[PDB]
């Protein structure tokens, strides 16, 4: 059984054959990885081998070096780095030599080079790589395949490694990339590959953009490629401009007027969609960058010091030119429209919205003309475009200024609701919703509020595309008619708003919309239920009775669906069934929080029985969540079901296979803790057993870990002293977690780290508070964790000295410092002050916009003061 033979078998559509080939390769690798890789690389490097054997060889090598799972990736790289340098050198030489010898267009060797480079560049073990790749591209004698394949490897390296790891070789890397992009280069495939590689290399080229001469060379070559006769190269080059504008905003004053404006404007007017999208994306990005600079401005302003970055207001200056192009682009809709399709029309719409929020009022005079001229055009394309434009600028300009405009347009908008074209009504329904959210006064009035409700109600019967948007509109009108029910002169709950008079006619109609032939587009059903959930939540007092009976309808419906298992067959009739159950559970969660407490006690027996029968996969998660809400409403009175529910809750936790349902369960424990308090002690040994098992189970999804650590805090709070038993295991686990470190290069792993850090902070908070007790007398048990105070403070110190953060982490850390003050007292002051970055975290929190971060950081600062002023 030659290796070439086995590799060719990896392409068989035969489950068994496919599995035989796999076991053999998995055994060879397990048996002797070094030789396995060397052997695979030999196969890949021989152009004499079939295309299939070579590609399969490359895939085996690749899968041995990297993984889409960040954790598995690091382990693979460590395993490779542990291989005899001589063996690795031989694999490296074969892969590198394969460049330019592969038939099949997408190169396999290119991916293997990158997988290895990701393990080695960060430890400086492949110094020969960059120069060889650079040489392959800049050698005038090199073939097209050779240059393309090499640029592909460069592109993959730039895409998969922390830019800071390539920073010291940016000069060389750029020489190769800028070389492949030159106008003189013969092959358009090489220019394409080179231009895609530049896009991935922009983050580590700062030192280069800081040099006037290098910056100018890069800009010239990129702008030059936007004029390449090859469309693919034109588009990629335009994307580089989009990114360059975003990363080097402050360096563009020099280029905007003499080149970028012209290039980006032309691109927008292109009949080639892909080109138009880049030109539009370019200006949408400028708006985003300028909006942020304004925020940065007001920031420093209220903070004293002057901003470090200052806007140039490119959006404002280009406004008079952008608007006419965007409004006309809005005219490029079509009968056959796709919602998840990102075309020039949709993009123009978003860009218009960003321009309005970036330039405010300034946009009205430029757009109003377009709107009046086409609001009545017989051509549905222009009529829709006009309505769309109107809706796109409702956010940004001053309300006071827009009120009269919207007020006067209402007659036309209402009529638009009855327009023959489905597209027009779709947009009309959306604009009505926008008005309710931005300029409510225009709708919630004693002249339009009635005809509006009338058309909205009638809209629920229109096509899904419109009915769905009408649901969102209703959803906002209620949210508006509610946000304008209180205030007055006191701080209490509303009583009876403008919809109360028709609150019921609406719930019944949404309930009917909800009863329409499924499979329907634009998720009508989901939208109606969602709308119902919103109108209920946004109901005043005098709505209670209506909400009461709606609660009964949901239950009955939930029960009628249960015994619907009579025609549950064929993957299509059951998918609507699982989502109906899912939609009703989520709905029950909303009315449950709106009815009185007695209503829950008079219904609890019914729901548990129901929710019980239901616990597919997506339904479980929804059932558990429904139970969480019932647990929050029942409170201690839930203890009654704990015996019958015990085995099921344990089920959700034990699984983990479907981390989603597992997460709802963990979340449920936390709710059980808050509802039962100490009464949960008898069930804790079991729950803690499963939770600890999940943690040490390296097969459990990563997003479950922090949810569990955070629950340790809820349990400690609920059981207090009884938590002593687990302290050793829990604190050891927390120390480990707290020391978790991901590559600050990955945004997804970074957010993960923040979530985890926040969860550790909450566990600590729960432990400290739980041991201290809920009285004006710090309980001795707190002292058990007293020798852990420095670690905690130090852990927060490091968190402080980390540009990542998040108001969430800052909030929890502030809360924890304050807890330590109240638990250990005076001595905590020295420890905090001996760690300067903590002080910075508190100041940072007191500035934050997040009320949680501002409240806790402020409360903590106070507690520390009391230690300063106490015996």
């Amino acid at each position: 059984m030659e290796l070439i033979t086995i590799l060719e078998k990896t392409v068989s559509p035969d489950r068994l054959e496919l599995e035989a080939a796999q076991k053999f390769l998995e055994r060879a690798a397990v048996e002797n990885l070094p030789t396995f890789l060397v052997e695979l690389s030999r196969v890949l490097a021989n152009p004499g081998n079939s295309q299939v054997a070579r590609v399969a060889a490359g895939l085996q090598i690749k899968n041995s070096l990297t993984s889409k799972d960040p954790d598995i990736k690091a382990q693979y790289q460590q395993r490779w780095l542990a291989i005899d340098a001589n063996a690795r050198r031989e694999v490296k030489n074969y892969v590198l030599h394969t460049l330019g010898t592969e038939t099949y267009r997408p190169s396999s060797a290119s991916q293997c080079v990158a997988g290895i480079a990701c393990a080695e560049i960060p430890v400086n073990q492949w110094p020969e790589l960059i120069p060889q790749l650079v040489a392959n591209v800049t050698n005038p004698n090199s073939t097209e395949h050779m240059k393309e394949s090499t640029l592909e490897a460069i592109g993959y390296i730039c895409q998969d490694i922390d830019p800071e790891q390539l920073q010291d070789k940016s000069n060389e890397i750029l020489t190769a990339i800028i070389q492949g992009m030159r106008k003189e280069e013969p092959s358009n495939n090489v220019k394409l590959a080179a231009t895609n590689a530049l896009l991935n290399s922009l983050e580590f080229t700062k030192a280069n953009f800081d040099k006037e001469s290098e910056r100018h060379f890069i800009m010239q070559v990129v702008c030059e490629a936007t004029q390449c006769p090859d469309t693919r190269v034109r588009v990629a080059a335009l994307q580089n401009l989009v990114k360059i504008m975003s990363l080097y905003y402050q360096y563009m004053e020099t280029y905007m007027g003499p080149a970028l404006f012209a290039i980006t404007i032309e691109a927008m007017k292109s009949d080639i969609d892909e080109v138009a999208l880049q030109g539009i994306e370019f200006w949408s990005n400028v708006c985003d960058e300028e909006m942020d600079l304004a925020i940065e401005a007001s920031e420093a302003a209220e903070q004293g010091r002057p901003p470090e970055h200052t806007s140039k207001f490119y959006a404002k200056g280009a406004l008079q030119y952008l608007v006419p192009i965007l409004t006309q682009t809005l005219t490029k809709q079509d009968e056959n429209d796709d919602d998840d399709d990102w075309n020039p029309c949709k993009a123009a719409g978003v860009c218009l919205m960003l321009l309005a929020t970036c330039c405010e009022d300034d946009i009205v005079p430029h757009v109003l003309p377009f709107i009046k001229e086409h609001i009545k055009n017989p051509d549905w394309r222009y009529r829709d475009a006009a309505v769309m434009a109107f809706g796109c600028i409702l956010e940004g300009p001053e309300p006071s200024q827009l009120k009269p405009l919207v007020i006067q347009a209402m007659p036309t908008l209402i009529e638009l609701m009855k327009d023959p074209s489905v597209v027009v009504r779709d947009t009309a329904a959306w604009t009505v919703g926008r008005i309710c959210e931005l300029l409510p006064e225009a709708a919630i009035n004693d002249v339009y509020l009635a005809p509006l409700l009338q058309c909205l109600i009638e809209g629920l019967s229109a096509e899904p595309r419109v009915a769905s948007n009408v649901c969102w509109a209703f959803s906002s009108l209620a949210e508006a008619a509610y946000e304008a029910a209180d205030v007055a002169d006191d701080q209490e709950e509303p009583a009876t708003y403008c919809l109360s008079s028709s609150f019921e006619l609406i719930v019944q109609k949404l309930l009917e919309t909800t009863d329409r032939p499924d499979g329907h587009q634009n998720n009508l059903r989901s939208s109606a239920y969602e709308s119902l959930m919103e109108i209920v939540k946004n109901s005043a007092k005098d709505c209670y009775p209506a909400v009461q009976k709606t609660t009964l309808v949901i239950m009955e419906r939930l029960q009628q669906v249960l015994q619907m298992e009579s025609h549950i067959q064929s993957t299509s009739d059951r998918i609507q069934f699982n989502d109906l159950q899912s939609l009703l559970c989520a709905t029950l969660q909303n009315v449950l929080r709106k009815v009185q407490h007695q209503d829950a006690l008079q219904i609890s027996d019914v729901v548990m029985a129901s929710l019980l029968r239901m616990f597919s996969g997506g339904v479980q998660e929804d059932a558990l969540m429904a139970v969480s809400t019932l647990v929050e409403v029942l409170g201690g009175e839930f203890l009654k079901y704990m015996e019958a529910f015990k085995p099921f809750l344990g089920i959700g936790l034990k699984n983990y296979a479907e981390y989603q349902v597992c997460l709802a369960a963990v979340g449920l424990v936390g709710d059980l803790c808050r509802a039962l308090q100490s009464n949960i002690i008898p069930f804790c040994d079991e729950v803690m057993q499963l939770l600890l098992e999940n943690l040490g189970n390296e097969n459990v999804h990563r997003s479950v870990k922090p949810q569990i650590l955070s629950v340790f805090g809820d349990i400690a709070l609920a059981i207090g002293g009884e938590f002593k038993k687990y302290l050793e295991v829990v604190l050891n686990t927390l120390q480990q977690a707290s020391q978790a470190q991901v590559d600050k290069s990955d945004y997804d792993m970074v957010d993960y780290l923040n979530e985890l850090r926040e969860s550790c902070l909450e566990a600590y908070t729960g432990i400290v508070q739980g041991l201290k007790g809920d009285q004006e007398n710090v309980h001795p048990d707190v002292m058990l964790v007293q020798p852990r105070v420095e670690f905690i403070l130090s852990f927060i110190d490091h968190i402080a000295g980390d540009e990542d953060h998040t108001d969430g982490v800052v909030a929890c850390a502030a809360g924890l410092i304050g807890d330590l003050c109240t638990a250990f007292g005076k001595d905590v002051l020295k420890l905090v002050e001996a760690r300067p970055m903590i002080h910075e975290l508190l100041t940072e929190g007191r500035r934050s916009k997040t009320n949680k971060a501002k409240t806790l950081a402020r409360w903590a600062t106070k507690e520390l003061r009391k230690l300063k002023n106490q015996a």
Binding site: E530, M625, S628, D671, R674, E762, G815, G818, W859
Partner: peptide, 24 residues
């Protein structure tokens, strides 16, 4: 299925917040 999780979570985190607060 997005709001069913992410939104029901916010409302939960708030449970602890108001809990720790009216205790702190």
């Amino acid at each position: 299925r997005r709001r069913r999780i992410e939104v029901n979570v916010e409302l939960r985190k708030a449970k602890k917040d108001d809990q720790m607060l009216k205790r702190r």
